[PDB]
Amino acid sequence: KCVSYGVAQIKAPALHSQGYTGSNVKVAVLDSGIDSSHPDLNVAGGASFVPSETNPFQDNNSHGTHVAGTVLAVAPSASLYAVKVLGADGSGQYSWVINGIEWAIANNMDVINMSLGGPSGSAALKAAVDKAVASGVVVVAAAGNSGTSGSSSTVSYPAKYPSVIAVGAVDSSNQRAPFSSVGPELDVMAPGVSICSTLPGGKYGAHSGTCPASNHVAGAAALILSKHPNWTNTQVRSSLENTATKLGDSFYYGKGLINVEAAAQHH
Ligand SMILES: [Cl-]
Ligand code: NA
Ligand code: NA
């Protein structure tokens, strides 16, 4: 298949070898669904809020299935939930996403991954992610793939909301990917170039984006909570941000590349 490096790059193998693989951590993938038929994917539960696509365990896009593979690669023992808020074409309404956030809160998810976003949000979308973080959920989002706009932030919503961890993409050499959105909202980087993960119908394929980068961070959160089940979302986020491997300027790199090994020992 594609060969990939991302799991090693964030130093997840260190935690796996100590017995920390994300067991009893609930991770909600708010995406195009998850193909649970994939032999490498073990999905704990699901809900679809896409009214024309009723099966959250069928992914007609393939984006949600790629997210799942990357999260389970980082946190093999995580309980993954398929929250379908995006259709086949990869687009959804903000009300579908809000319904998936509400579902994640109600069902005691530890982590939300939103591998999505647009250039504008809404009060109702901000209320939803703010409410999830108030409830103690770790919320992670792709920073966006809008490159640079001189002085302007190009970070998408929901990542642009202070409550949400905003993740940009680096390559295997820790260089910012030219597509990775920029701005003071940027928190951390993770592997986002040619990420090999699961695709529907038992396949594998590489994808580049801030979405695969956010998937590494959602996984890292689950590893941390499988060592520190007592930690608040506040402590989880602070551990990832404060032990990041410093790279370039924060506008481009935030705090740098997540190091889940370091994060799992933060004091
Ligand atoms: Cl369907
Ligand atoms: Na399966
Ligand atoms: Na944010």
Author numbering: 2 to 75, 85 to 277
Paper excerpt:
Omniligase-1 is a broadly applicable enzyme for peptide bond formation between an activated acyl donor peptide and a non-protected acyl acceptor peptide. Mutation A225N in the S1′ pocket and F189W of the S2′ pocket increased the synthesis to hydrolysis (S/H) ratio and overall coupling efficiency, whereas the I107V mutation was added to S4 pocket to increase the reaction rate.
Despite extensive screening of thousands of conditions, Oml-1 itself refused to form crystals. The crystal of Pre-6, that differs from Oml-1 by the single point mutation W189F, was grown in crystal form B, identical to Pre-3, with the same crystallization agent, polyacrylic acid. Among other single point mutations in the omniligase variants only I107V effects the substrate binding pockets and reaction rates by enlarging the hydrophobic S4 subsite with one methyl group.
